[PDB]
Amino acid sequence: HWGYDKHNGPEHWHEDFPIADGERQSPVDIDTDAVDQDPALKPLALDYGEATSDRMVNDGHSFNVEYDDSEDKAVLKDGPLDGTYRLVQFHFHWGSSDDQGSEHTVDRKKYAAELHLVHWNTKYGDFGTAAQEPDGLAVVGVFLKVGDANPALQKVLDALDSIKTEGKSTDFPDFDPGSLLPEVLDYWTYPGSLTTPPLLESVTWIVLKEPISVSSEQMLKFRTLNFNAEGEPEELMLANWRPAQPLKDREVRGFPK
Ligand SMILES: [Zn+2]
């Protein structure tokens, strides 16, 4: 049962999921004195106005806000991409104290948490087919910097008491995922992987340069979730981040530089 504790955490994942030691694993440190420009890169296009959130679910690893991805209500295009990517869900990673918790780092700096907006390439018909392809998935990562409380985020945090344990779900309508974005969408990109098992090497990462905020009090709420199901031994989600993995000569590109 993979997790984040000392016996089942990231340093052990390679036993059941050997791709953990792969060529294109995520997250990574983004060293900003090593980032390259590429005139092929474009502005990020996030078309989220019509998005329809459905529900929030404690999956035993984090919690996911699920979207209707049966059509193009919430899509990602451009940036480094060459197709149309539908938003299926977003979730977060966070740490046990506010000084740590992001998966990506920027010149070794750790934010308090990181938002992952997970998308899949429509041409593959569904998420599972897409997850097996190098160009199949695209994840937008947004740092959460501890400081000012964030009203958009509060709406997510207000629902977490309804999904405290694994397998619980709650209705969650009308949440605009764009409300969790910075105003300007400058980004870094590189080829990588999912940051949880199965760790599949199918993700084009788009990591936004500008964090959104979170308060220290808000951060407490993330840590109240339970990894386990009702009636099982409790183990709170105090931390659920994978550390930086080796870049292995992949190119990190930046837009606009
Ligand atoms: Zn994630």
Residue numbers in the entry: 4 to 260
Give the original sentences from the paper that presented this experimental model.
A well-studied carbonic anhydrase II was selected for rational design as it has efficient CO2 hydration activity and could be heterologously expressed in Escherichia coli. Thus, to better understand the key factors controlling halophilicity in enzymes and to develop a halotolerant biocatalyst for hypersaline conditions, we undertook rational enzyme design by selecting just one of several mechanisms present in halophilic enzymes: increasing the incidence of acidic residues on the enzyme surface. Herein, we describe for the first time the successful redesign of a mesohalophile enzyme to an extremely halotolerant orthologue, that is, one that is active at 3 M NaCl and above, by altering 18 surface residues. In contrast to suggestions that large differences in accessible solvent area, non-polar surface area or absence of large hydrophobic amino acids are the important features that allow halophilic enzymes to function optimally in high-salt environments, we have found that increasing the number and distribution of surface acidic groups alone is sufficient to impart this characteristic.
The conversion from mesohalophile to extreme halotolerant enzyme is conducted in stages to assess the effects of substitutions on overall protein stability and degree of halotolerance. Crystal structures of WT and engineered enzymes were obtained to confirm the presence of changed residues, that active site residue positioning was unaffected and also to compare the overall structural similarity of the designed proteins with that of WT. The structures of the four engineered enzymes superposed almost perfectly with the WT enzyme (maximum root mean square deviation (RMSD)=0.42 Å for M4) with no significant differences apparent in their secondary structures. Some of the orientations of other surface residues of M1–M4 were also altered compared with the WT, although none, with the exception of N62D, were in the vicinity of the active site. Up to 18 amino acid substitutions were made to the enzyme surface of bCAII, but this did not significantly alter the secondary structure, catalytic activity or stability of the designed enzymes, compared with WT, in the presence of added salts.
